[PDB]
């Protein structure tokens, strides 16, 4: 029920990253049970609340679209079970109230992570997040 | 441009806090400290989170333009800013508490976690209000 490897571990994060930093006007209540899968359950009131932020801000008038744009580094937290993950996010904002524009928002993103479901076989889990934005 | 991504990187470490991450959050500050500055950002940052008990998290972002100089006879360069912390219960209600802050740190160059070497020396804060 739990496959450990750098393979596992970037797909797991590519999409728990597309989940919670990107969005569609389409499908919202799917996208929160996914993301919540993904989530430690201490950790799944602060993926509502960024979840809830995007809403607030994309309404149904924008589209985001966001993508791992960098390596993914990874150590180990001294005396703890959690690993770090930092790497870079790409989010492509284009509003559907045009024809022809769009703007990119550029993050830096570390990640906490261990192992604990037709969405997360194996167990994935996010414990914590911490963001610094690039402009 | 890669400054302001470090010193954004130090103000949130020092000033943010989150239960999960809390020991990688202080391995982390200690990497943006000069040995000779470890000690008293450690003692800052353990009065920091005095404020935070059980299901709270704090964030902590640069909130006013930069200000740089150069520190005479010296390799430092003096930065002086506004920092926005928000504090927020790690549960579903809705309160957020907002704390603002005058900061300048003395900044060198001496790796994952800092790798250009952005090292401070030493930091003064002040209230907003």
């Given at each position: 029920?739990?496959?450990?490897?750098?393979?596992?571990?970037?797909?797991?994060?590519?999409?728990?990253?597309?989940?919670l930093?990107?969005?569609s006007?389409?499908?919202?209540?799917?996208?929160?049970?996914?993301?919540?899968?993904?989530?430690?359950?201490?950790?799944?009131?602060?993926?509502?609340?960024?979840?809830?932020?995007?809403?607030?801000?994309?309404?149904?008038?924008?589209?985001?679209?966001?993508?791992?744009?960098?390596?993914?580094?990874?150590?180990?937290?001294?005396?703890?079970?959690?690993?770090?993950?930092?790497?870079?996010?790409?989010?492509?904002?284009?509003?559907?109230?045009?024809?022809?524009?769009?703007?990119?928002?550029?993050?830096?993103?570390t990640?906490?992570?261990?192992?604990?479901?037709?969405?997360?076989?194996?167990?994935?889990?996010?414990?914590?997040?911490?963001?610094?934005?690039?402009?």
């Amino acid at each position: 029920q739990i496959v450990n490897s750098e393979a596992v571990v970037d797909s797991a994060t590519s999409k728990f990253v597309s989940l919670l930093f990107g969005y569609s006007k389409n499908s919202l209540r799917d996208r929160k049970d996914q993301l919540m899968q993904y989530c430690d359950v201490s950790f799944q009131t602060q993926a509502m609340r960024m979840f809830n932020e995007n809403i607030r801000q994309f309404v149904d008038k924008v589209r985001a679209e966001a993508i791992i744009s960098s390596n993914i580094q990874r150590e180990k937290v001294k005396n703890s079970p959690l690993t770090r993950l930092t790497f870079f996010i790409t989010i492509k904002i284009t509003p559907d109230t045009m024809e022809n524009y769009e703007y990119i928002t550029k993050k830096q993103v570390t990640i906490y992570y261990d192992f604990a479901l037709i969405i997360n076989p194996f167990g994935f889990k996010v414990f914590d997040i911490q963001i610094t934005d690039l402009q």
